[PDB]
UniProtKB/Swiss-Prot annotation:
Coiled coil: none annotated. This is Serine protease Hip1. It is a lipid-anchor. Disruption phenotype: Disruption of the gene leads to growth defects and attenuates the virulence of Mtb. Disruption of the gene enhances host innate immune responses, compromises the intracellular survival of Mtb in macrophages, and increases its susceptibility to lysozyme. It prolongs survival and reduces lung immunopathology of infected mice. Disruption leads to earlier and significantly higher levels of key pro-inflammatory cytokines and chemokines. GO terms for molecular function: carboxylesterase activity. One of its GO terms (biological process) is post-translational protein modification. Serine protease that promotes tuberculosis (TB) pathogenesis by promoting the processing and the extracellular release of the M.tuberculosis (Mtb) heat-shock protein GroEL2. Hip1-dependent cleavage of multimeric GroEL2 results in release of cleaved monomeric GroEL2 into the extracellular milieu. Conversion of multimeric GroEL2 into monomeric GroEL2 is likely to be a mechanism for regulating GroEL2 functions during Mtb pathogenesis. Keywords: Cell membrane, Disulfide bond, Hydrolase, Lipoprotein, Membrane, Palmitate, Signal, Virulence. The gene is hip1. The lineage of its organism: Bacteria, Bacillati, Actinomycetota, Actinomycetes, Mycobacteriales. The keyword Hydrolase applies.
């Protein structure tokens, strides 16, 4: 890696060639993008981070993390972020949808699960899968999975000149983590995994646990908002879900589920039902976004949807000029190869029935008896990994940070990951997704002592 100054720090950027196929090590070649924030004091090595997604830029994430990085950490480590294969500035980047493709989907209510509804959705999905293939070719898509990301990470480890890896993983970055840990356990110096993905989980039970997370986060937000003046969801939190549906269901034509009646916005699109739901989910990632959610809901009372639309844009990575990054398309590609998709329709139908019961705030109308299959059931290349209990006997003790009411990565996922890893579980008491290097003194001290000293939190450490 020949470094070079970036395009906001002492930042150096560079690129690193890895092979697309690792069995064809002289075949097609991908170029990963890297950012580097040189340590200020005495350098132990590099702290490599991943934000998750998948499809999220690590370069982008390092620039944020740099802002909230404890002084001692910044002294002891080069902060290093990378864009994984197919993601953001890495070439080739995964691309399936155009900006117009994305907008067209987001305009739909996406709520009709009748036979005709399921056929419509399942048709847009096929068109999507076809767009991925035509633009990427099946070979590249076959090799975008985490198992190969893990191999690139070691190539990264070596190119940065560290003998052993120091790694901070967030959310899906957690799966990159346990993967690298299983393949190169003897190359791991230290590892923090925050907001855990449990690779031994059943995907349907996981998704349902996630539904339950967001409903429970919904409940927490609403209870909190009810203490406040003019709560758009009302002063009785036991009726918040009903009030919420009185605000969002009018965005769907009651005589016809496929017709958007968007709330007015200064943006030309207005606010569809599906955008409304996506904005809500986005806001429930963090209590920091609750104010915005409340604003959006209050706008809905006056038939306006500007804040919810902006929340949905934040989630979908659509900038002010209507442009998308490739996080969405990459997200799908990578998720589809990391595990075998649910292909049994009865399973998908029964999941739907349960989810409406578990997360009503998210569900529109009644169970129909039909449900679409997910994009992955149509993937033209097979998975390159599969659910299993993480096993890395030789691994150094690691830290898993799990938040008690994390909607995206539920607390018990993090416990389970810790156990398979036989590392330390650091608990955060909150309703948010991830927490490391995000302002909390306690968490950050624990993480700093582990990263520098090698010191794990005591059993039962809460924060």
């Amino acid at each position: 890696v020949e470094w070079t100054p970036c395009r906001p720090g002492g930042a150096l950027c560079g690129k690193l060639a890895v092979p697309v196929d690792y069995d064809r090590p002289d075949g097609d070649v991908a170029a990963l993008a890297l950012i580097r924030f040189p340590a200020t004091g005495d350098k132990i090595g590099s702290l490599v981070i991943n934000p998750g997604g998948p499809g999220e830029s690590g370069i982008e994430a390092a620039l944020g993390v740099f802002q909230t990085l404890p002084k001692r950490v910044h002294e002891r480590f080069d902060l290093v972020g990378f864009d994984p294969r197919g993601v953001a500035s890495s070439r080739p980047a995964i691309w399936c949808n155009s900006d117009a493709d994305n907008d067209r989907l987001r305009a739909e209510p996406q709520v009709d699960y009748s036979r005709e509804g399921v056929a419509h959705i399942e048709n847009e999905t096929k068109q999507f899968v076809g767009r991925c293939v035509d633009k990427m070719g099946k070979n590249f898509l076959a090799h975008v999975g985490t198992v190969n990301v893990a191999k690139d990470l070691d190539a990264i480890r070596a190119a940065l000149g560290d003998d052993k890896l120091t790694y901070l993983g967030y959310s899906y970055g957690t799966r990159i983590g346990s993967a690298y840990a299983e393949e190169f356990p003897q190359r791991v110096r230290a590892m923090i995994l925050d907001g855990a993905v449990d690779p031994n989980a059943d995907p349907i039970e996981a998704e349902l646990r996630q539904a339950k997370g967001f409903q429970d986060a919904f409940n927490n937000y609403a209870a909190d908002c009810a203490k406040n003046a003019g709560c758009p969801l009302g002063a009785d939190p036991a009726k918040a879900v009903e009030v919420y549906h009185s605000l969002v269901d009018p965005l769907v034509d009651p005589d016809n589920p496929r017709i958007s009646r968007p709330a007015r916005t200064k943006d030309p699109r207005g606010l569809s039902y599906s955008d409304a739901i996506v904005g809500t989910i986005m806001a429930l990632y963090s209590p920091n976004l609750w104010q915005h959610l409340t604003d959006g809901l209050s706008e809905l009372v006056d038939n306006r949807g500007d804040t919810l639309l902006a929340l949905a844009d934040m989630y979908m990575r659509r900038d002010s000029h209507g442009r998308y990054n490739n996080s969405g398309d990459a997200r799908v590609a990578i998720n589809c190869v990391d595990q075998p998709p649910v292909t049994d329709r009865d399973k998908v139908i029964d999941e739907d029935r349960r989810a409406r019961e578990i997360a009503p705030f998210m569900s529109y109308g009644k169970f129909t008896g039909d449900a679409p299959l997910g994009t992955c059931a149509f993937w033209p290349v097979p998975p390159t990994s599969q659910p299993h209990a993480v096993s890395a006997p030789g691994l150094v003790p690691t830290v898993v940070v799990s938040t008690t009411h994390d909607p995206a990565a539920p607390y018990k996922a993090g416990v389970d990951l810790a156990n398979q890893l036989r590392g330390s579980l650091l608990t955060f008491d909150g309703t948010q997704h991830t927490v490391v290097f995000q302002g909390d003194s306690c968490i950050d001290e624990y993480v700093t002592a582990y990263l520098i000293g090698g010191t794990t939190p005591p059993s039962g450490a809460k924060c």
